[PDB]
């Protein structure tokens, strides 16, 4: 990361080397490489910053984990590559499991993740690592869950996850919270909580949110999860980014 | 193995094997895979098809090529692995030849890149080998072009390119064509004709144009080039998507199987 601080893609610049290595440790899965740069453009795009429809999807999203009688998160290999402590910390603050979940699942990947983990809590509780349970409709490989993760969850945080999944976990009656960059992706427009930010900014901000809310009565929270509306929420973001590109015509550099 | 072909999100998937495979082969660069994903964010925002103002833009890509002196046709890491054998049949349909320019260039990404190409032509001269000549404005190991190539050219089609390269070239009196799906990027801004389409879909347009107007008259050929606006391409890009933007915002897209 050798370039000036005044670099306006520092940030970008920076996280693009922790998905390499990420890749470079053998987590990060190829077509995690390339789901990084759909997300580099979106964020480009949304102005790099968490975006009030982003924020008030993480207020939801919170107030709904604090409910849920068993909250989990999954981890994937880019998860693990740019904010593994970071999702060690939203599971303690939701009082959440982890649970190593991949659409690509090997031995390798696996042991890896869980080690990249265990760099930041050598004793965190982390599930997926020998899955029996399976997501309905999905192929054998990649609906692995775990009997005691997501299996038995009722809420759950799928992250940078594959539309096919997203979609399946809802139909057999998990509630859906997931973080993308991408608001057309089928993911984003079938999960029920889509938090359109990057997911550096969204997971620290959520640890705060949880903390911001710690001390919320079930009738707040009831309230806040209440009258959320992830329709209008994707409307929105896509009018942001409508705005956003009208801007970014009007600067820069030209020529004629 | 493959992506069923009923799956909807079928050439998404295929075409990410590709570039995927293509670094397994050698071809691309790991970064190559990241561009690439930036491509499809915005294959997202255009709606994944060739819109009109791309189609435009084609026209007069060929145009200008089949009018060209000296037409080159640049291949990299991430052509290689999705259009290699469309990149070989534009280059003859124009009659333009085929340079070799990579980002992170190695020995082995070269030979490979060209291996590639030969399994749909063992007889196609590939340029760009062992580039010679350095083209001034660019960091020593990103500006060297081959001296029969690119640096004698007048008509360059480098697409999937980097600004600083589609800007060197414009600044070295090159006419520049590109394609980048990004219509905001630097190359977007610099170059001469900007198609803004996934180059999954624009080589074998191309390829299908250069051979339709193949025997237009240079008249024909002058007015297409002639009246053609690349600024006014570009807003009318801008516009397709902040319109594609604003109608689904207003129709809504929670729980659409598809837009
Ligand atoms: N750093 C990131 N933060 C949040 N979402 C991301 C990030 N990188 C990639 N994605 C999302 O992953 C999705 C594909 O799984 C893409 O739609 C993209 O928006
Ligand atoms: N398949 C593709 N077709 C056209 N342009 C692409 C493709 N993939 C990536 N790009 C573009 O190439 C640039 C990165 O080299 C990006 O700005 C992106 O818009």
Same mark, same amino acid.
């Given at each position: 990361?050798?370039?000036?601080?005044?670099?306006?893609?520092?940030?970008?610049? /920076? /996280?693009?080397?922790?998905?390499?290595?990420?890749?470079?440790?053998?987590?990060?899965?190829?077509?995690?490489?390339?789901?990084?740069?759909?997300?580099?453009?979106?964020?480009?795009?949304?102005?790099?910053?968490?975006?009030?429809?982003?924020?008030?999807?993480?207020?939801?999203?919170?107030?709904?984990?604090?409910?849920?009688?068993?909250?989990?998160?999954?981890?994937?290999?880019?998860?693990?590559?740019?904010?593994?402590?970071?999702?060690?910390?939203?599971?303690?603050?939701?009082?959440?499991?982890?649970?190593?979940?991949?659409? /690509?699942?090997?031995?390798?990947?696996?042991?890896?993740?869980?080690?990249?983990?265990?760099?930041?809590?050598?004793?965190?509780?982390?599930?997926?690592?020998?899955?029996?349970?399976?997501?309905?409709?999905?192929?054998?490989?990649?609906?692995?869950?775990?009997?005691?993760?997501?299996?038995?969850? =009722?809420?759950?945080?799928?992250?940078?996850?594959?539309?096919?999944?997203?979609?399946?976990?809802?139909?057999?009656?998990?509630?859906?919270?997931?973080?993308?960059?991408?608001?057309?992706?089928?993911?984003?427009?079938?999960? @029920?909580?889509?938090?359109?930010?990057?997911?550096?900014?969204? /997971?620290?901000?959520?640890?705060?949110?949880?903390?911001?809310?710690?001390?919320?009565?079930?009738?707040?929270?009831?309230?806040?999860?209440?009258?959320? =509306?992830?329709?209008?929420?994707?409307?929105?973001?896509?009018?942001?980014?409508? @705005?956003?590109?009208?801007?970014?015509?009007?600067?820069?550099?030209?020529?004629?």
């Amino acid at each position: 990361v050798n370039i000036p601080k005044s670099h306006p893609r520092y940030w970008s610049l /920076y /996280y693009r080397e922790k998905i390499i290595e990420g890749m470079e440790k053998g987590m990060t899965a190829k077509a995690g490489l390339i789901a990084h740069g759909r997300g580099e453009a979106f964020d480009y795009l949304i102005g790099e910053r968490t975006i009030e429809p982003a924020e008030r999807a993480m207020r939801a999203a919170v107030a709904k984990f604090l409910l849920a009688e068993h909250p989990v998160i999954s981890v994937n290999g880019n998860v693990a590559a740019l904010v593994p402590k970071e999702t060690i910390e939203l599971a303690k603050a939701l009082n959440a499991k982890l649970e190593i979940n991949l659409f /690509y699942r090997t031995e390798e990947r696996v042991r890896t993740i869980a080690e990249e983990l265990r760099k930041y809590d050598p004793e965190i509780e982390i599930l997926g690592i020998n899955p029996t349970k399976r997501i309905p409709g999905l192929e054998h490989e990649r609906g692995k869950v775990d009997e005691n993760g997501i299996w038995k969850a =009722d809420v759950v945080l799928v992250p940078l996850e594959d539309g096919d999944r997203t979609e399946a976990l809802v139909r057999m009656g998990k509630f859906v919270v997931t973080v993308d960059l991408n608001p057309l992706s089928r993911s984003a427009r079938m999960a @029920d909580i889509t938090i359109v930010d990057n997911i550096v900014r969204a /997971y620290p901000r959520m640890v705060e949110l949880a903390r911001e809310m710690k001390d919320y009565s079930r009738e707040e929270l009831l309230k806040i999860v209440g009258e959320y =509306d992830n329709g209008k929420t994707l409307s929105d973001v896509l009018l942001h980014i409508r @705005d956003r590109l009208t801007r970014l015509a009007e600067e820069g550099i030209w020529r004629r």
